[PDB]
């Protein structure tokens, strides 16, 4: 919609190859990224996306570019492995947003969390307030941690909230089969 | 300062260079050379090189425009 | 406990310690030397073995303490040589 | 038509890696240079240039 | 003779200056970041000749050594333009400022490795660590992180050397003492560390010292030397004898000059 | 007039690239800054695509320059183009009718741009051969008879006017240079050097004695007659030999 | 010592020159002209110098 550079966090981990999603969690993610990139790009050609991984070991797959093809290629080669690396993922994306390869835009992170994240809440809230100063927004689309694990993440959105521009959004869907029609909200 | 001046002179002429063959030394810093173009000149030569260890059969590099034995 | 001042030592002291005879040590050093546990030469003019060190000696701690003072003496000696050079002219090879 | 003309020469000998003997036909014998884009493998003793 | 090695690095003077310029111009300095770049050049049989370089941006975290940001794509595209300009420009390695190493040094390395197994890492500090050559080169592959005391010398192209000039025993001895002092500092340091239960427990470090002492120096001291010395004076005695003769020979040629000058002057009327 | 200031680093950058270019024309863009029209600073330069046909007015590539500027901007060193360089290697420092045309295109874009020319083949003298050019553009080209001159400068434009070439030094780059020689490795290199000579001395001695024996009968024979260029050479030769022996002596 | 240095800087300046042809004088004439046959070239009448 708006003029914004989004760093896309893909969650590649061992819950993401499991068939509690039809057919494969990576495939369900894959459709969702695709819908979001085309909607945003269609609004303006100025928009940019970078990709980073929230799991295994944090890596920036791509910096700012406005092209769907890279985005798609990465997901096809993967057999997802890893464990959750959430705190650092926020931190490497955050640093990347500061300086660009694209255009002077607003900072958004769109993230899929298909795995059971457990954080040290106290440090996390400190990092939440540091983001708020730079006025950085994060959107988590979460499944695979409602009915198998806690919703610490509600607190994460809440803490950052103090205004709408940091009030962010938690989009919660059950761990059972869901196909992105509601995962694109 | 003396040294500095000595650096400049070796530079002044550099490649490409034309060939001539030494006819004779007329006197101090003057020579008759015959160029291999086949035009003979009476020429200047710079003091930095021996003037009687030069053979009368020695081919020599002279500048083209100034015609002095480099 | 200082630098080496020699490494010639005769059979007699070793043979006593080892509790094998004078004849045996000659054959033995020769066995040792094949392996290169011993680095050394055998002098048959006073029946002494000149050794050459190569021993590890793992964990020194006390020797290290001494080592710090000896090195220190060394820094000063070169320094004196330097002063004299400074005083007179400029080393130009040309 | 802008492009430069090509003079024919033979190498007498190689003096330095920068100096060559050529006996050209714009003028007489000359000592000449050579491009630093050109191979060493092409330096071969007595060739047409 | 000059020191040579199996692999060797030659780094051009142009390259070095470029880093000096990069540090002041990027203007990011005053945050005390690593100034890092990629080095380019010419390599052959076993010689790295660092023909070129280009700076790379980087932003690292100033409270995390795990969080740092670098872009691959920047390297491909720029490399591509360089190939287009000059094709004699291969990827040799990279540079970091130093003067200390990081854990993260390992992290920049993994990437350069891929492009060529040999990636030189040059530690370059303008700010003078050393009063000889202030640039030192290491070549590193992980086991852990290795180093190599590979020579660094300044070779040049014809143009580069003239430009340098446009801009413009005793040396041995100052350096020699310097080296002694650096080791000296390390022993004091070691003693302190051992006293206060700090990681050093390296076997190698004690091992090197012991052998070294056995030998002794011979530009000072006599203790181990004295037996060798007996031969030594006799050889020196002969060199000197030769020297004597030649001084007379020189003196003689000077006489010939004087007599000629005298004659010439005397007959003229005398004028110098 | 005008003064263009070329960076310390800059000259070396220019020379390398042109030398590779030999003997074909190379051009690039110059970056730096303008203050008034009195001073021109050249911080940096970049090359554009190569040509064996020669530079042309349409030989500019828009993508290349645009793209590079972004990448330089990212590194934290943006600037505008102050003008352009073109090479003449021994084709005379004086600009061709073709280059003026080229030069006019840029100046249509600018309000004033500098042409820097290097002759790289005449740069192997061992000191600089660089020229800086502009067009005849009055203002202070007007600064035999007195009404004749002002009108002549006015009437006719686009004649060759070389201008002053300069630089400004920078202390950090100056110091770096001094280090690159030394009468890390150097520490070892010095010590080594002292050692190596002593071993060889046995051989050196023999050669050193040989020269002296040949030289002596000659000076006697020459004594009789006038002088010639070998007598002197022979005398000079011996002087140097001796100096070399001292250094061998010095090492212990 | 200074005189010699001045001799050196001078020398660089002069050196850009253009040479002289060798000829042989066939015979002198009283017009204060000489007929010369130049060796690869032709013969000319030329006007003597001052000295």
The answer to whether residues E158 and E165 touch, using CB atoms and an 8 Å cutoff, is no
Rounded to whole angstroms, the Cα distance separating A92 from A60 reads 8
The reply to whether residue F230 touches residue B12, judged by beta carbons under 8 angstroms, is: no
Residues E27 and E140 in one domain: yes
Beta bridge partners of F194: none
Question: Which run of H or E residues covers position F46?
Answer: strand F39-47
The reply to whether residue G5 touches residue B2, judged by beta carbons under 8 angstroms, is: yes
| Interface list for E 46-65 with A (CB within 8 A) | 57, 59, 61, 64
The reply to whether residue E71 touches residue A60, judged by beta carbons under 8 angstroms, is: yes
Beta bridge partners of G29: G33
Residues from chain F that touch C92, judged by Cβ atoms under 8 A, are 183
The reply to whether F241 touches chain D by the CB within 8 Å rule is no
Task: Please name the method used to determine this structure.
Answer: cryo-EM
Residues from chain B that touch F125, judged by Cβ atoms under 8 A, are 11-12, 14
- Pick from D13, D21, D29, D35 the residue to mutate for testing the B interface (most B CBs within 10 Å): D29
The reply to whether residue A91 touches residue E69, judged by beta carbons under 8 angstroms, is: no
Q: E34 lies in which domain range?
A: 6-168
Answer whether G touches F (≥3 Cβ pairs < 8 Å): no
Residue A23: cis peptide before it, omega within 30 degrees of 0: yes
Question: Which run of H or E residues covers position E17?
Answer: helix E13-26
Rounded to whole angstroms, the Cα distance separating F30 from F51 reads 18
How close, in Å, is residue F76 to chain E by CA atoms?
Answer: 5
How close, in Å, is residue F147 to chain E by CA atoms?
Answer: 44
- Going by C-alpha positions, the residue among F199, F195, F227, F231 that lies closest to residue F216 is F231
Residues from chain F that touch B51, judged by Cβ atoms under 8 A, are 229
The reply to whether residue A63 touches residue E73, judged by beta carbons under 8 angstroms, is: yes
The reply to whether residue F22 touches residue D35, judged by beta carbons under 8 angstroms, is: yes
Residues E13 and E113 in one domain: yes
Q: What is the DSSP letter of E242?
A: H
How close, in Å, is residue E243 to chain C by CA atoms?
Answer: 16
Place of tokens 């060199």: E239
Phi-psi region of C10 (alpha: psi -120 to 50; beta: other; left: phi over 0): beta
Does the annotation flag F88 for ligand binding? Answer: yes
Rounded to whole angstroms, the Cα distance separating D11 from D19 reads 11
Resolution of the PDB structure in angstroms: 6.8
Rounded to whole angstroms, the Cα distance separating A165 from A142 reads 20
Sign of the torsion angle spanned by Cα atoms C9, C12, C18, C20: positive
Size of interface B-D (CB pairs under 8 A): 26
For chain A, the maximum distance between any two Cα atoms, rounded to a whole number of angstroms, is 41
In a domain, E191, yes or no: no
The reply to whether residue B46 touches residue G11, judged by beta carbons under 8 angstroms, is: yes
Residues E155 and E249 in one domain: no
In a domain, E199, yes or no: no
Looking at E139, E168, E197, which one is the last position of a domain? E168
Residues 6+ apart with CB under 8 A from F181: none
Rounded to whole angstroms, the Cα distance separating F173 from E25 reads 13
In a domain, E196, yes or no: no
Rounded to whole angstroms, the Cα distance separating A172 from A174 reads 7
Rounded to whole angstroms, the Cα distance separating E76 from E54 reads 12
Q: E-strand spans in chain E?
A: 8-11, 37-43, 47-55, 59-60, 68-69, 90-96, 120-124, 135-139, 152-153
Sign of the torsion angle spanned by Cα atoms C20, C21, C27, C30: positive
Residues 6+ apart with CB under 8 A from A127: A87, A90, A91
In a domain, E201, yes or no: no
Nearest-CB residue to B18 (from D18, D28, D33): D28
Question: Residue A173 CA to chain centroid, in angstroms?
Answer: 15
- Going by C-alpha positions, the residue among A18, E130, B60, A21 that lies closest to residue F180 is E130
The reply to whether residue C57 touches residue E210, judged by beta carbons under 8 angstroms, is: yes
Residues E153 and E218 in one domain: no
The reply to whether residue B5 touches residue G5, judged by beta carbons under 8 angstroms, is: yes
Rounded to whole angstroms, the Cα distance separating B37 from E173 reads 59
Using CB atoms, list chains with 3+ pairs below 8 Å to chain F: B, C, D, E
Specify the long-range contacts of residues F51-56, CB closer than 8 Å, at least 24 apart: F51/F24, F51/F25, F52/F24, F53/D2, F53/D3, F54/D2, F54/F24, F54/F25, F54/F98, F55/F25, F55/F27, F55/F86, F55/F99, F55/F102, F56/F102
End-to-end CA distance of chain D: 22
The reply to whether residue D37 touches residue F121, judged by beta carbons under 8 angstroms, is: no
How close, in Å, is residue E192 to chain F by CA atoms?
Answer: 26
Residues E219 and E95 in one domain: no
Phi-psi region of F121 (alpha: psi -120 to 50; beta: other; left: phi over 0): alpha
- Going by C-alpha positions, the residue among A52, A63, A68 that lies closest to residue A12 is A52
Phi-psi region of A160 (alpha: psi -120 to 50; beta: other; left: phi over 0): alpha
Looking at E168, E185, E217, which one is the last position of a domain? E168
- Going by C-alpha positions, the residue among A78, A88, A65, A70 that lies closest to residue A26 is A78
In a domain, E71, yes or no: yes
In a domain, E192, yes or no: no
Residues from chain C that touch F247, judged by Cβ atoms under 8 A, are 93
Strands A106-113, A4-10: parallel, antiparallel or unpaired by DSSP? parallel
How close, in Å, is residue E78 to chain A by CA atoms?
Answer: 13
The reply to whether D16 touches chain F by the CB within 8 Å rule is no
Rounded to whole angstroms, the Cα distance separating F36 from E270 reads 64
Residues from chain G that touch B46, judged by Cβ atoms under 8 A, are 11, 15
Domain residue limits, chain A: 3-185
Joined tokens for residue F47: 């090359």
Residues E132 and E213 in one domain: no
Q: What is the DSSP letter of F248?
A: H
- Going by C-alpha positions, the residue among A68, A66, A70 that lies closest to residue A47 is A66
Residues from chain B that touch F228, judged by Cβ atoms under 8 A, are 52
Rounded to whole angstroms, the Cα distance separating F146 from F150 reads 7
How close, in Å, is residue C8 to chain F by CA atoms?
Answer: 29
- What's the half-sphere exposure (Cβ side, CA atoms, 13 Å) at G37? 3
The reply to whether C93 touches chain F by the CB within 8 Å rule is yes
How close, in Å, is residue D33 to chain B by CA atoms?
Answer: 7
Rounded to whole angstroms, the Cα distance separating F235 from F229 reads 11
* Tally of domains within chain E: 2
Nearest-CB residue to E66 (from A60, A63, A88): A88
Place of tokens 């992170």: A109
Place of tokens 């819908």: A35
């Amino acid at each position: 919609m708006v003029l914004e550079s989004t760093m896309v966090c893909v969650d590649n981990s061992e819950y993401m190859r499991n068939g509690d999603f039809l057919p494969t969690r990576l495939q369900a993610q894959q459709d969702a990224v695709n819908i979001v990139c085309h909607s945003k790009t269609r609004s303006n050609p100025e928009n940019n996306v970078g990709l980073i991984t929230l799991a295994n070991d944090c890596e920036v797959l791509t910096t700012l570019t406005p092209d769907t093809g890279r985005i798609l290629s990465k997901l096809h080669t993967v057999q997802p492995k890893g464990k959750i690396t959430f705190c650092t993922g926020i931190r490497v994306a955050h640093l990347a947003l500061k300086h660009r390869q694209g255009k002077n835009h607003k900072m958004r992170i769109i993230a899929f969390v298909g795995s059971p994240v457990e954080d040290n809440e106290k440090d996390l809230v400190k990092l939440a307030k540091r983001l708020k100063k730079e006025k950085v927004n994060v959107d988590i689309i979460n499944f695979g941690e409602e009915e198998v694990n806690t919703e610490k993440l509600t607190a994460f959105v809440n803490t950052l909230n103090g205004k709408d521009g940091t009030g962010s959004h938690l989009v919660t869907v059950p761990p059972g089969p869901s196909l992105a029609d509601a995962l694109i909200s | 300062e003396f040294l500095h001046a000595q650096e400049e002179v070796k530079r002044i002429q550099s490649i490409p260079l034309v060939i001539g063959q030494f006819l004779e030394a007329v006197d101090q810093n003057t020579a008759i050379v015959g160029s291999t173009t086949g035009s003979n000149y009476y020429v200047r030569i710079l003091s930095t090189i021996d003037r009687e260890l030069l053979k009368p059969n020695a081919s020599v590099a002279l500048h083209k425009h100034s015609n002095a034995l480099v | 406990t200082r630098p080496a001042n020699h490494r010639q030592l005769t059979f007699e002291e070793i043979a006593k310690s080892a509790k094998i005879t004078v004849n045996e040590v000659e054959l033995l050093v020769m066995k040792a030397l094949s392996v290169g546990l011993v680095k050394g030469s055998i002098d048959e003019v006073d029946k002494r073995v000149h050794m050459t060190w190569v021993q590890p000696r793992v964990l020194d701690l006390q020797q290290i303490k001494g080592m710090k003072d000896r090195l220190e003496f060394w820094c000063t000696d070169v320094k004196s040589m330097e002063m004299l050079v400074e005083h007179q002219a400029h080393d130009i090879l040309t | 038509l802008q492009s430069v003309g090509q003079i024919v020469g033979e190498v007498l000998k190689q003096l330095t890696e920068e100096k060559f003997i050529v006996k050209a036909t714009n003028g007489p014998r000359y000592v000449v240079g050579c491009r630093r884009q050109l191979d060493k493998s092409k330096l071969k003793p007595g060739t047409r240039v | 003779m000059p020191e040579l090695a199996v692999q060797k690095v030659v780094v051009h003077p142009l390259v070095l200056l470029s880093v000096v310029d990069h540090f002041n111009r990027i203007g990011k300095v005053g945050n005390q970041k690593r100034v890092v770049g990629v080095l380019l050049g010419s390599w052959q049989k076993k010689v790295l000749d660092v023909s070129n370089s280009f700076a790379v941006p980087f932003d690292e975290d100033d409270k995390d050594d795990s969080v740092w940001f670098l872009d691959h794509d920047y390297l491909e595209n720029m490399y591509g333009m360089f190939k287009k300009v000059n094709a004699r420009e291969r990827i040799v390695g990279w540079y970091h400022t130093g003067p200390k190493l990081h854990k993260n040094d390992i992290a920049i390395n993994e990437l350069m490795k891929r492009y060529c197994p040999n990636s030189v890492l040059v530690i370059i500090d303008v700010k003078p660590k050393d009063l000889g050559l202030p640039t030192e080169a290491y070549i590193s592959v992980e086991e852990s992180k290795t180093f190599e005391h590979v020579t660094s010398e300044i070779g040049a192209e014809e143009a580069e050397e003239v430009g340098v000039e446009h801009l413009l025993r005793i040396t041995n001895q100052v350096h020699g003492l310097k080296g002694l002092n650096s080791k000296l500092l390390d022993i004091r340091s070691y003693l302190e560390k051992v006293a206060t239960g700090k990681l050093p427990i390296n076997h190698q470090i004690i091992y090197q010292l012991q052998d070294v002492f056995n030998l002794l120096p011979d530009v000072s001291l006599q203790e181990f030397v004295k037996a060798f010395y007996l031969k030594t004076n006799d050889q020196m005695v002969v060199v000197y004898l030769a020297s004597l003769i030649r001084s007379v020979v020189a003196l003689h040629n000077l006489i010939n000059n004087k007599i000629a000058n005298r004659d010439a002057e005397k007959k003229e009327g005398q004028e110098k | 007039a005008e003064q263009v200031y070329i960076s310390s680093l800059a000259l070396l950058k220019m020379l390398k690239h042109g030398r590779a270019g030999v003997p074909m024309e190379v051009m690039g863009l110059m970056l730096g800054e303008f203050v008034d029209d009195y001073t021109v600073r050249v911080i940096d330069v970049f090359a554009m695509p190569q040509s064996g046909t020669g530079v042309s007015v349409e030989a500019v590539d828009p993508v290349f320059q645009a793209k590079m500027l972004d990448m330089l901007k990212q590194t934290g060193r943006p600037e505008m183009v102050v003008g352009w360089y073109h090479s003449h290697p021994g084709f005379g420092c004086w600009l061709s009718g073709v280059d003026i045309n080229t030069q006019q295109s840029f100046e249509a874009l600018s309000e004033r741009a500098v042409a820097v020319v290097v002759d790289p083949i005449q740069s192997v003298k061992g000191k600089v051969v660089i020229d800086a050019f502009r067009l005849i553009n009055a203002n202070m080209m007007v600064l035999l008879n007195k009404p004749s001159i002002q009108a002549l400068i006015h009437g006719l434009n686009r004649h060759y006017y070389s201008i002053t070439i300069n630089y400004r030094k920078n202390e950090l780059e100056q110091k770096m240079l001094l280090n690159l020689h030394k009468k890390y490795s150097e520490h070892c290199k010095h010590n080594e050097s002292v050692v190596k000579e002593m071993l060889e001395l046995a051989k050196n001695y023999n050669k050193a004695v040989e020269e002296e024996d040949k030289m002596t009968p000659e000076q006697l024979a020459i004594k009789n007659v006038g002088k010639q260029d070998p007598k002197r050479h022979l005398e000079e030769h011996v002087d140097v030999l001796m100096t070399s022996n001292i250094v061998q002596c010095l090492a212990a | 010592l200074n005189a010699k240095v001045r001799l050196l800087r001078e020398e660089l300046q002069l050196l850009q020159e253009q040479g002289s042809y060798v000829g042989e004088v066939v015979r002198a004439m009283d017009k204060k002209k000489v007929l010369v046959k130049v060796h690869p070239e032709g013969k000319f009448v030329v006007d003597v110098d001052k000295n």
